[PDB]
Every structure is written in structure tokens, then in C-alpha cells.
Amino acid sequence: GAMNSSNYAELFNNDIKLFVDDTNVYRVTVHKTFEGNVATKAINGCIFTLNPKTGHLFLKIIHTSVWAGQKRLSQLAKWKTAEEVSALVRSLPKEEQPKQIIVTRKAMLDPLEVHMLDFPNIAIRPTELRLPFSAAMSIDKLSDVVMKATEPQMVLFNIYDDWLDRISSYTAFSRLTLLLRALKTNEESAKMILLSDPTITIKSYHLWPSFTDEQWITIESQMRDLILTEYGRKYNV
């Protein structure tokens, strides 16, 4: 059934599974027209498809041309998401195909189920977890490849950089979810914490800075403080 706090360790077992987050597929700027009406302008988006055990991120860039001449775009965006996830599964060798796909938003269930009818043994699941994957576009290198795209493109990343050399998938996912929750709550503050000490850089081949184990503990602390600082500023107490 639903993925929740009670069945959380299942993410890091040896059954291939992917999270699919569709919150950055259809993105718009809202603006006034010359006549004083309101219009939208689409900008490039992305499907965020992540293996939580390996860190492999299948970032399908959604170019604004997809939307041209289409109606009901927020509805179409769920179906386009399901079409592209289905195409990704069919592109993988059988031994790499996921056993389960967990959608971050319940509105993705029917679209994905219908596109995956040919895969009756792949379980399509919701989650009770409130995951911060909307904040993926606060990772500079991911935002840059999305905004520069001139055509539909799939770009592969490991969202954990080399962390799995030193830590378990459980701890790597916890670190990622804390970083993305901080970036989601106060982007400027989170980026300042990550990028303040200029001596710690991001490797060309990485998304996050090259923190030693001790530095990660300090960073993790500063992120938890930010989430509680911001939760204080929000609710006043």
C-alpha cells in the first residue's frame, strides 16, 4: 500500500525502486498582459526520478515546446510524466527495471498505472512521506541543465555524489532530504550555509560540496537550526 514512517527501511533494501516527483514538470511565470489581463509563460521543467538506494537520478528535462498548442496543461503534465517514466522503464534492461515506483503525489497514481499496464508486476505506490523533491531546482547544476535545454533531454546524476563510499543509503537519503527540506524552507539561508567557506568546493563531477565527515555533521546541524529558525519565524514561537 502507501509508503510511510512504519515501512521506511524498505527504501534501502535490494528491491529496485524509484521515486517519481512531478512538481517541477509544468512550471510557469504568471504576468499581466498589455490589456491588464493575466497570462502564464511556461519555463523548462523536469521529472525527478530517483533510486533512493543508489542515488541514481534520471532527470528528464521537459522543454516548453511540449506544451505548445495543448490544453489543460496541469492535467497533461501528469500524463506526460507517466509517459516518460514508462519510456524510461522500457529503456532499462529487465534486470534494472524497478519492482516498485513510489509517486510523491497521489494524482500521479492513475496516469502511471495506465501507462504501466504492460508491467503488471511493477507496483505503483503512493507515500504518506512529505518529501522535499520540489526543491531539486534549488541545486544549481540541476537548475542550470534544465534552464539551458533547447530540446527534450534526459541527464543522469548521482544525487549522493560519492557519499555511499562512507555512509549507508539510509544516512545518504536522510542527508539529501534534510538538505532539500532546508533549501525548500529558506533557499538563500541554505545556499549560504553550503557555500559560505570558499575553501570547500564542489567537484566538477559532483552536485554538493566536498565536506569531510566532521564538516557534514556541522552542515547537518546548521540545516536543522535553519529549519527550526524558519519554523520559529513562521509560527512566531
Binding site: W79, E83, P111, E113, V114, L117, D118
Partner: protein, 300 residues
């Protein structure tokens, strides 16, 4: 003009004949039902006074043979049987009529209710849904499951309704996923109408039979089939005008006849709300919408 005689009535029972019903006492001198209108299928149905779990009956058409009811004290039910000796049967029926030991099918001359509920229902189609080829009549009860229910046990005692599943390869053409899921016209018109049923009359007959099994036996799988066949039409943007107008008439009489007190177990809130207020056909079912809003506004 047709008659279904009873050998006897050894156990107290409520007997239904189509939309009518009457109580028979244990060992009451009851010998059956006369003046049954020729031209329609009929259903005779039973609920035992000592055990309301025993809820069962027989679809028949008196044009297809001479049928009678006889209680079986071993299997503990009223069984339909065919009498092959025409002269014996005519002689039995004449005696029971002369002695006035039969109830009269109580049709009001003005009243087209039964025709309106069975317009498209044919015995030959019933006998394909309910498989017992050695009899010309068909047994249904409250507990019989559908082929679709048995997929999600005993196959020979099942209701062979046409399987409708909105999230099935049959319903969804490769490459037309969003189109076919949000607009079921291809599934309705190509797969179901052209492919399986051959015409709208057979589709309506199955829909009508499913509703009647739901209403008369509380058959849960029949109720599912009735609502699936409504939803498949209501969820199609492209439906012939004649089918929409006919469906409005069909549903109007079904809602009119449903006992008020079973509305809560016989009607699916989600399907009716979707069909009347959200679907492609939300504005096509004028008569149905009006009777539902006046009779069952709580559901809506």
C-alpha cells in the same frame, strides 16, 4: 395468459413475481401464478420466512416451455422444473384454475413498468450469462459471484457478465493512454458495442438484467456490473443520440422502481454524482437527473 403452477407450498415463503410479492403460509393451499403476460421474460423469486439468507429465483419465458415450481425437501428450496407432457400440464393448470388456488399476475392496464425494466432483456442472453444449458430457465441467488469478482470460485455457479475494467489493456490503446482513460468512447463504441455486444440492444439488455438481479436478489456483483455499464456510457464523449435518450428512459424506470429503503445499498454515490454532475453526459440524462434529485437528494 401463461401459468406457473406450484405442486404445493410446504414452507412459509415470500414469493416475488417480477416487481410484485406476496406471503404464503406453511402448507397454505397455494398452487401458483396465472395470467402471466406473454411477450416478456419474468422472474419468480423466493425468500424463506424462517431464513431470509435463502433468496433466489428463476428467470423464464413461458413461450419456451411449460414450467412449474416444486419444493425439494432435501435441497430445501422451491425448484423450477419443465413439464414435457403438454396435456398433463394443461390438465393440472385447468384443475387449479377451476379450484381458484392461483394468484393472478396483478398487472394494472395503464402500467408499463415491467416492459420498461425488461425492454432489451432476452432469455437467450440470460442463458449465456447464467450457464445451465439443460434447463430453459435460469437460477440466480443473492450469493452468486461474477466472473470479474472470481478473478480478483466455482465457475459453473457464476454470473458471466461482460468484464468491464477501466484500467485494463482492453480499455486503453497503447499510445492513447490519457485520451482513452479520460474519454472512454473507443472502449464503449469499438471494443464493447462493435466488438462484444454487436449492438446497443444487447448492451442495454445486460445492463437491465444486472440491475434486476441487484434489486431482486441483493446480488452485489450484479450491482457492480450495472454501475460499470452506466459509467462506461457517461464517461464517453461520443455516444449515439438514440443510446443516450434510451439510457435516460432505462435509468428513470430503474430509479422509479427501486425500493426507497434499499437506495443506500443499491446506489453508488461516486458513480451517480460523477454521471449526473461531472461526466461528458452530465446534461444528457434529464429524466434520470430529475427523479434522482426528487427521490434521493441525500445520495447527491
Amino acid at each position: 395468459m401463461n401459468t406457473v403452477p406450484f405442486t404445493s407450498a410446504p414452507i412459509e415463503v415470500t414469493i416475488g413475481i417480477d416487481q410484485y410479492s406476496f406471503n404464503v403460509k406453511e402448507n397454505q393451499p397455494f398452487h401458483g401464478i396465472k395470467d402471466i403476460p406473454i411477450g416478456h421474460v419474468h422472474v419468480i423469486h423466493f425468500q424463506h420466512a424462517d431464513n431470509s439468507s435463502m433468496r433466489y429465483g428463476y428467470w423464464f419465458d413461458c413461450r419456451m416451455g411449460n414450467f412449474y415450481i416444486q419444493y425439494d425437501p432435501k435441497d430445501g428450496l422451491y425448484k423450477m422444473m419443465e413439464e414435457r407432457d403438454g396435456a398433463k400440464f394443461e390438465n393440472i393448470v385447468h384443475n387449479f384454475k377451476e379450484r381458484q388456488m392461483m394468484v393472478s399476475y396483478p398487472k394494472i392496464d395503464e402500467d408499463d413498468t415491467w416492459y420498461n425494466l425488461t425492454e432489451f432483456v432476452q432469455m437467450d442472453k440470460i442463458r449465456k450469462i447464467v450457464r445451465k444449458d439443460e434447463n430453459q430457465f435460469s437460477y440466480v441467488d443473492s450469493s452468486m459471484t461474477t466472473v470479474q469478482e472470481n478473478e480478483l470460485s466455482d465457475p459453473a455457479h457464476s454470473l458471466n457478465y461482460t468484464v468491464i475494467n477501466f484500467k485494463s489493456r482492453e480499455a486503453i490503446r497503447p499510445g492513447h493512454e490519457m485520451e482513452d482513460f479520460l474519454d472512454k468512447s473507443y472502449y464503449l463504441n469499438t471494443v464493447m458495442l462493435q466488438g462484444i455486444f454487436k449492438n446497443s440492444s444487447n448492451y442495454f439488455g445486460e445492463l437491465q438484467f444486472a440491475f434486476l438481479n441487484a434489486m431482486f436478489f441483493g446480488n452485489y456483483g450484479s450491482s457492480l456490473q450495472w454501475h460499470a455499464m452506466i459509467e462506461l456510457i457517461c464517461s464517453s464523449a461520443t455516444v449515439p443520440k438514440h443510446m443516450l435518450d434510451k439510457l435516460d428512459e432505462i435509468l428513470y424506470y430503474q430509479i422509479k422502481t427501486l425500493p426507497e429503503q434499499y437506495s443506500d445499498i443499491l446506489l453508488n454515490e461516486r458513480v451517480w454524482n460523477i454521471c449526473l454532475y461531472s461526466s461528458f453526459q452530465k446534461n444528457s440524462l434529464h429524466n434520470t437527473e430529475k427523479i434522482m434529485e426528487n427521490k434521493y437528494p441525500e445520495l447527491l
